[PDB]
Design a protein around this ligand. Sequence first.
Ligand SMILES: COc1cnccc1Nc1nc(-c2nn(Cc3c(F)cc(OCCO)cc3F)c3ccccc23)ncc1OC
Ligand SMILES: [Mg+2]
Length: 343
Amino acid sequence: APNFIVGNPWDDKLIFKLLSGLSKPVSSYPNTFEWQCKLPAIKPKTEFQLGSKLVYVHHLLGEGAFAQVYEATQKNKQKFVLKVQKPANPWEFYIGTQLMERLKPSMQHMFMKFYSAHLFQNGSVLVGELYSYGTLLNAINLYKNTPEKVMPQGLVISFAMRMLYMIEQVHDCEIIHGDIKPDNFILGNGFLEQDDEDDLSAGLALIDLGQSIDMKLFPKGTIFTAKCETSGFQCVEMLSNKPWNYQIDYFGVAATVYCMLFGTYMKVKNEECKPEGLFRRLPHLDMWNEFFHVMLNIPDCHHLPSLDLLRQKLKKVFQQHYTNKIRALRNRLIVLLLECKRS
Ligand SMILES: COc1cnccc1Nc1nc(-c2nn(Cc3c(F)cc(OCCO)cc3F)c3ccccc23)ncc1OC
Ligand SMILES: [Mg+2]
């Protein structure tokens, strides 16, 4: 069991050392393309050339740190997404490739498809599948201008269950996402198309692998100690100067669910670690207390709570209360989401 400390799994030197040590380098992947020129100008409402093809850039979907994310089109025209990094970030493509190799085939539908990496001298462009109904953060914010004010519980629970099941699979692959939050969840046609009454909402994917960690590249028992990057929320361990590995994602899923529940960011306090708010008036109060308690009070790296059990507890409540409500709750969000995309 002995702890092998890696202080900072995001350190640029370390990422360089790890990607250099690979037997199958990212450049050798079949869908990686290296170009001996600089990154073309990529801006809204203009074309640019990507290797052989010509790509029209529609609008900016997000930007942050070294990355900009764009919607784009290539006789019938397929829409897609570009993630442009300056300087080059092969790390994301590395993680995304490993994830897809490791995931059980039956789970791959829960993840955004990717198509190619183009490595230029001063940057990279990754090409991905478009989820055209925006982020979960945007969705939560859409509820703020309704009389409802927040997402309804039935949908909150459907989404929370999908997240737990999703991260269960990611962790089974020995990957840590590292930056789980509402603005890293995206909503796609799978959600629009969802006609059935299944407990898990389709069309939800988790993207942005900028803080992702491959535990297969480190020794058994590896733990980390650093606090998070500029855009991240500090997890419980970082907040009390303790080591972490998979706990960071438990915390992220909790913060994300919290944000669905209250429409604002999670702040925590100690008594046991607990989120602020969480008033007596909340529906399913006992379920939520138990949820947040288990997600936020992980004794150590050897006592990671069962994501399956966490989900089974939510599922019991969902099955009791929401099986006959969920279709109408989803349809109502569809109506808000399609209105938002009209502007
Ligand atoms: C409303 O926003 C979106 C709608 N549809 C698709 C993507 C959206 N947005 C965002 N995409 C990404 C992103 N990350 N990555 C890296 C990535 C990945 F997330 C998964 C990968 O595959 C694992 C299985 O999905 C591979 C990757 F290279 C990508 C690659 C290719 C293209 C995009 C990404 N990062 C931030 C984003 O917004 C803040
Ligand atoms: Mg991030």
